[PDB]
Structures are given as structure tokens and as C-alpha cells.
Design a protein around this ligand. Structure first.
Ligand code: ANP
Ligand code: ANP
Ligand code: MG
Ligand code: MG
Ligand code: ZN
Ligand code: ZN
Lengths: 437, 434
């Protein structure tokens, strides 16, 4: 393919060459951004940025800007050129719209498809994320179609596809790849066990699990891998409005797809943008026509490093800590979900602790988790000792019976996919007449 | 491959030839599947157009028995997508498609007499979970360049309140949802402060399927949404779209893409027209060949020419709504009741109802706002007296009884798993965040 117009891993031999692949797109990107009502209004009465050098002066685009411009204030092409329209997860009251041409979709699908394990025609790919307005289900399906994998559209949060039916599909279709968030990986494992199947042995064709959408510690990621037989759990970082911006290498670090976007770290205190360090993730996608974004702040706290990785990819690594501002403090001690997660998932695998939750009170950390009765007291004691050793916070830890946080019906209930029925026989329950879901 | 378009045939004889010329390929493809290889093991299988007249019907129970890949005629490497049918979960029905199979599927859906255009914004409000329906409409929208808004259905992510907001704010021009969902969206619109007959000026057509739909109900759904076309099609997960509405309001069989026959289940005879069970042999599919697949829907196929000038037979689908219940001296079909319910004046706003056939009496409930309820009860009773003569027990209910207010107004944030909460936060959304 002498013919392909977007860069691939291996097209650049140095960071200087990568920087050139980026800057050579900025005149097109800056001209396209100005066609949107939002950027045309932003630079009204001034000379707009046109050149690679002008980009250093470009003002950040905030989430609140995208919400204020709902639905099509960020639109730079005729609506006739849109292929799909999406809205972000989170608050329903203040939606964020994103939208993509067919050519925009090719870039999106390529970035998702950068899975170090490969996606092949030989694969059966269960897409277990939502298709309702959000991009995630559509994105995985598009990458599956691109690479010829058989796509099984599992959807998520749909009454049509409960966990019991997904477990049966995983086993009976010999599914080789999955796409779902890390909590859904443990939900599927709990559903398998409730169906009398061992996730570590009874799914021999499952070769990788693709995941995103949650901050994921290496301790949790490795436990999720071990639960499913030691297979790779392949993380990516993305959003509805950016698509996939980073993907895992074989060493287990996420690398920024810097050939497809200019990535900057925003220090909200000084207002400076830097190519690496700690701060808020800023993205300028290079290969989109419909919805240009100039220095869009995802407002995730990230650590970007240019330090080499054992994978040898010539791309910076990124750790995603969480959403900016989300931390809690109890003693002098900062309590992060990420620190608690590392302690919970360091309990021996034999204790089967997967489901937990915690509440920061001013004085004390309240934490609950499900564990089988025989190991429950051990789990409470060891997790307490871990909190003492690592954080020194006062705690109130309660072990719960399985079925308490995650009900049995979520794991085992089957649901017929009915249609509206208006006339029933005497013996039939007519309660499913109009509300048939 | 080269697939026919409306207008490629000038007569029924030419249509019959477009079909028969595909049958050698279709019969050889079917034989590659374990199911048809086993069916014709130790015989000479059918090879020619003439041999097709002798081909045994394929039943739904065959597709269930062959779960998952007994109907598969290509290497799995060539599959693009895998689907399972709606209905019983305990006994799944698998279907699957190559990329080229998908082009035929998308083309058949896209035969919408109103057109699908790049100028369109197309809300897909059917499920994407395993079933084909959401994927099919999305594929046809992508094929014709319409902006696809993936609404999904039966998803906690996309309640009615949010779909009504999307209809209005995105100037949606086309919808895809079942006929019950058309009335659910109308009730949700009023609950959002929007009049379905006036406040959606860019909505130009509503595409629908999946339910038996009387012309009386279809015309009422049109009137509720300001007199815009309600464009019906007939399909299934295992066949795709097999008939679509013409501008005269009849569904025409897509006979250029499939051989349609009417099955008498008592004699087992197959006829090109008349009353009986819908039998389909798709002509342009490689992955999952079907020879005379019996959808087991009760249909009436007619060869009578239509004012639309399409040279294709028309089909009415009675289905499960065609099957009588004896009550009084009389026999009552869902389709006959539906015609009487939707013959009540539009201004009574009767959209949601249900009925139970007892041996002695028809029990029927419907929502009607105060103060038209007792008029509606009386007129519907008189209609049942005049038309059916069945004893009835009719109850008018307050709106919010059959279709709860919560279904129409509830908004739901799309949350992710959260493990650490502040004191004042509800931590019940920790692991069960849907
Ligand atoms: N691998 C990851 N690690 C950590 N956080 C992640 C990861 N992937 C996604 N996220 C988080 O999820 C966000 C994107 O959520 P997603 O639903 O995929 O898009 P969205 O529709 O923009 N939702 P939202 O921003 O939450 O309103 C990112 O900004 C991060 O906060
Ligand atoms: N226009 C229509 N009029 C009447 N019935 C229809 C119409 N369209 C679809 N149907 C019914 O819906 C069935 C197909 O349901 P659908 O969910 O679209 O496919 P499926 O998931 O394959 N279901 P099934 O094969 O019956 O188990 C048809 O066989 C008919 O019974
Ligand atoms: Mg368009
Ligand atoms: Mg394949
Ligand atoms: Zn690496
Ligand atoms: Zn016609």
C-alpha cells in the first residue's frame, strides 16, 4: 500500500520525523477548524491561525465549549457528508455531540484496530459495549469489519443481551476476542461461574480481552487476566469525541497515537501546554473533517512520558489516573480509587474478591466487598492490614454475602426478546402486552 | 456480483427468469452446509431450476437444531457478522452474513419509496443486541449516505425522553422503529411538551416493521405524526427485508432477490400466490443458504397489478394476529380488534390497549384521558356489537396505567463503574451502574 494516506507504526524512525508527520497536517487542520461556527466565532475580528508555528498560540477547547455548541456548532462540513452522529456518556441534561464522515470513520477504525494481539478473519469478536448513541459499540464493530473478524454484537445495558446469554455465546461460538469495560470482564467471569463454567479453563479459544473506559491499575488488569486463564487484557484510552488516542503495547503500557493527533499536557495552574509530564490530556486530532478540535481538553489527569519502553515503539506512554478533581482525603492520607483497587486486587485470587465499593467519610474509610463465607474473615483482616501498612487511614471494612452487591438475577436470568402483543389467550399473562421489553 | 434493481424486468416471465438463472448457484451453495449435505446424503441433490420444484421445506426447528453453524456454507473467516433471532432465548436461532451478503441486505432495506438521501438524518430506534434490525437500518443508512443516529432500543442508555429530544434538536427526517414504538414516541413527545402533529416539521417519514399492522392503525400512526408517510416492510433476522411498501400503501415482495411461495401446512403444497405460510429462498447469500425456509407467518400473496406500477406481487401479513379465538358465537383476531380500537376518533387519544380472549367474553382495557373515557368505552362496545357480536368487558384506564409515566419521562445518566464515593454520594451505582 504505497497508496495509503494516513501514517502507520513504523513510518517514522525518530521523534523529529514524528513531529514532521504532525506539523505537515496543521495547515489543512487549521483551515478545516475555521469552517465550524465555533472557531469562526472564536477568531472573528482577528487573523486566524493558518501555519504549524501559529498552532503554539491556539487557545484550549473545553468540554463546556462542546456542550454550549450542542448540537452542530463544531460542524465544519455539510450535514450531507456525516456518516454517524454520537453523544457522550455521563450527564443526560447536558449532552456532548460528536459526528464523523465516512473518511473520519476510517481513521477511527484504524486506531481501534491497533491491538498488539492483532484482529484477524480467524477471530470471532464479541462487542459487549453499548450501541445506544455512544460510539464504543460502533467503533469496535467498525474495526472488526475492517480486519474481517466475525462481529457478534452483544451490545451492553440492553434487555436483549443479559450476561447469562453472553456466557453461552462466549462458549458455544468459540469467541476469540471481547470488547467491554474492566467491570464487565469481572461480571462475565461471575456469570460464567454461576453457569458452572471456569473462566480460567472452559473458554480455550478466548485469546484476548480488549478493554477501556475505566482507570485500570496493573494489579487489577493482571488479576482480570488470571481470572480468564492468563490471556492478555489489552487496554486502550479514548472518548466519543476523540476516538482511541492510546493503546497497549506487549509490555502492558498505553502509547499515544501521536501520528493521528498532537497530544499536549495542560497544567491548569500555570496554563502551560507541554509535550510530556503530569496534567490534563489535550488532543488535536489530525485526520477528521466533520468536527475539528483544536487543543481539546479531555480534563483527564494523565502522566505522559517520552522515556523508552521495552516494546521499542517510537511513541510516548500515558498513564490515566482518573478525572481531574476526583480525589478524596481522610487523615493527611490521599485515598484514590486506584490505590484502594491495588489493595483489593492484591488479596489472593482464591478469596474471589471482585466486587467492592468504598465511601470517604471525613474521619474513616467505609469499604464493602463480596466474598464467599469461608474466606470472608481472612479477606476483611488482610485488606485492613493492607490499608494500615499502605495508607494508615482509619477504616470500617465489611465482607458481604455473594448476591448482595451483584444480584444472582443479573448473573443467571434469561430474557425472551418479545414484541408487542395486544390479544392474549385466557391462560397467558397479558402483562407483556405494550411494555414487552 | 450483479444484483437486479426495480425496473430490470418488464414482465412476470422476465422476473421468473432472473430467479431461475440463480438457482443452480443457490442449490450448489446450500449443499456445502452440513444441514443440506446431510439432507441429500445418499441421494443425488437438486442441481437445476426444474429440480427446485421438488425441494423439501426448511423449518425454524431445523435452524434451532443446527445451532450454531449447521447452516454454514463458507469458512468462518468469510463471516462479517453473526446474529440471533428475537423470541425464545432457551432455543436460539443463529444467522450470519459475509460482506457481500450484507450488500444484498442493505439494498433490500433501502428500497423505501420515500427514498433515503444524504439530506436525511435517520434515527435507528430498534435493538443492536444480537438481532439484525438496528444493524440492518444502520447499513442501509450508510449505503445511501443518511446521517445515522444509533438510538438502539431496550437499552438503559437511550430512554424515550432522550429519543424525543434527539428527534426535535437534530431535525431528524426518518425513523426506524416498530409500530408500538411510534405511539410510545408520540406519548413521550407530549410528556416532553412537544406536539407530534406539529413540532417535528423536518420529520418526513417513519419506517416500521416487526408487528402485524392494519391499514387503520398505520393511517392513525401517520395522523398522530402530522399525516407523514408510515412506510412498512416485512422481514426477519434470518432473511432480512423480503417486502416493502409502495406509494399506494401495499407491501411488494422483493422477488428479484428471493423466490417467494405460499405453503399449505395440511397438504404441504407450495403455490406462487394465495393464502398460507410465507416460504423464502434467498438468491444472493453465501454464508447461510436457505432452501424454501418457512417463516411460518400466515400471509396472502396476490399477483394483481398495483397502481405503483412495480411488477411484483403484493403481500399482507396476518401472522399470529390472524389466528382466531372463539369467544361468543364469533371468532376474534388481533387484526380485527386493532381495526375497531384505531377506528375510534383520533381526538380520544386511544393508542395503548390489550385484550384477553376468555371462552365466554372478550376482556379489553385501553388508556384514554379524562374526559373522553366513557364515550370511548361506549363507542368501542357498540363497534364490537356491530362488527363481531362477542360479549365484552371493556375498561377505560387513566393514561399512565398500561404505559407508566416513568417510561415516557425518565432520563438516565450513562454512568461507568465507580468504586470510591464521597459521603454525600449514593454508592448503589458502584458495580450495578446501568
Ligand atoms: N484506559 C482508560 N483509562 C482511564 N480512563 C479511561 C480510559 N479509557 C477511557 N477513560 C475515561 O473515559 C472517558 C471517556 O468516556 P467514554 O464514554 O469512552 O467517552 P465520553 O462519551 O466522552 N464520556 P464522558 O467524558 O465520561 O462524559 C475518558 O475521558 C476517561 O475519563
Ligand atoms: N410488516 C410485518 N407485518 C407483520 N409481521 C411482521 C412484519 N415484519 C415482521 N413481522 C413479524 O416478525 C417476524 C420476524 O421478527 P424479527 O425480530 O424481525 O426477526 P427474528 O429476530 O428473526 N424473529 P423470529 O425468526 O420469528 O424468531 C416475522 O417472521 C413476522 O412474524
Ligand atoms: Mg448525511
Ligand atoms: Mg470472519
Ligand atoms: Zn510499550
Ligand atoms: Zn404497489
Amino acid at each position: 500500500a504505497m497508496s495509503r494516506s494516513r501514517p502507520e507504526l513504523g513510518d517514522w524512525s525518530s521523534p523529529a520525523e514524528l513531529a514532521e508527520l504532525q506539523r505537515s497536517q496543521l495547515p489543512r487542520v487549521l483551515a478545516q477548524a475555521l469552517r465550524s461556527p465555533f472557531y469562526a466565532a472564536r477568531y472573528r475580528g482577528t487573523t486566524p491561525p493558518r501555519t504549524a508555528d501559529d498552532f503554539a498560540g491556539v487557545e484550549v477547547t473545553a468540554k463546556q465549549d462542546l456542550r454550549d455548541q450542542y448540537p452542530f456548532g463544531m460542524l465544519a462540513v455539510g450535514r450531507e457528508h456525516l456518516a454517524t452522529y454520537h453523544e457522550s456518556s455521563g450527564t443526560a441534561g447536558e449532552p456532548t455531540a460528536s459526528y464523523y464522515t465516512e473518511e473520519d470513520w476510517t481513521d477511527l477504525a484504524e486506531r481501534f484496530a491497533r491491538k498488539w494481539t492483532g484482529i484477524h478473519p480467524s477471530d470471532t469478536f464479541l462487542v459487549r459495549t453499548p450501541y445506544g448513541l455512544v460510539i464504543t459499540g460502533h467503533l469496535a464493530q467498525a474495526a472488526g469489519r475492517l480486519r474481517g473478524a466475525t462481529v457478534v454484537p452483544g451490545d451492553a445495558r440492553s434487555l436483549a443481551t443479559p450476561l447469562s446469554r453472553m456466557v453461552r455465546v462466549l462458549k458455544t461460538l468459540d469467541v476469540t476476542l471481547t470488547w467491554c469495560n474492566p467491570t464487565e470482564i469481572t461480571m462475565l467471569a461471575a456469570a460464567a461461574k454461576a453457569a458452572g463454567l471456569r473462566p480460567d479453563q472452559d473458554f480455550p479459544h478466548l485469546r484476548a480481552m480488549f478493554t477501556a473506559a475505566e482507570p485500570l491499575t496493573e494489579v487489577r488488569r493482571r488479576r482480570l487476566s488470571e481470572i480468564w486463564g492468563g490471556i492478555p487484557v489489552v487496554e486502550e484510552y479514548g472518548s466519543t469525541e476523540t476516538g482511541t488516542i492510546a493503546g497497549q503495547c506487549p509490555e502492558g503500557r498505553m502509547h499515544l497515537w501521536a501520528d493521528r493527533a498532537i497530544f499536549e499536557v495542560y497544567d491548569p495552574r500555570t496554563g502551560t501546554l507541554s509535550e510530556a509530564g503530569r496534567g490534563q490530556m489535550v488532543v488535536t486530532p489530525l485526520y477528521r473533517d466533520a468536527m475539528p478540535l483544536l487543543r481539546y481538553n479531555l480534563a483527564d489527569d494523565v502522566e505522559v512520558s517520552t522515556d523508552p519502553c521495552g516494546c521499542g515503539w517510537l511513541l510516548p506512554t500515558v498513564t490515566v489516573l482518573g478525572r481531574a478533581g476526583t480525589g478524596h482525603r481522610i487523615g493527611p492520607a490521599t485515598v484514590t480509587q486506584q490505590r484502594l483497587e491495588e489493595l483489593v486486587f492484591s488479596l489472593p485470587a482464591a478469596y474471589e474478591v471482585m466486587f467492592w465499593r468504598a465511601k470517604a467519610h471525613p474521619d474513616v474509610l467505609e469499604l464493602e466487598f463480596e466474598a464467599p463465607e469461608p474466606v470472608r474473615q481472612r479477606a476483611v483482616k488482610e485488606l485492613g492490614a493492607a490499608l494500615d501498612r499502605e495508607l494508615g487511614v482509619p477504616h470500617r471494612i465489611t465482607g458481604l454475602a455473594p448476591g448482595t452487591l451483584v444480584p444472582a438475577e443479573a448473573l443467571t436470568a434469561q430474557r425472551d426478546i418479545l414484541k408487542a402483543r395486544y390479544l392474549f389467550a385466557e391462560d397467558e399473562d397479558w402483562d407483556k402486552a405494550v411494555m414487552y421489553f
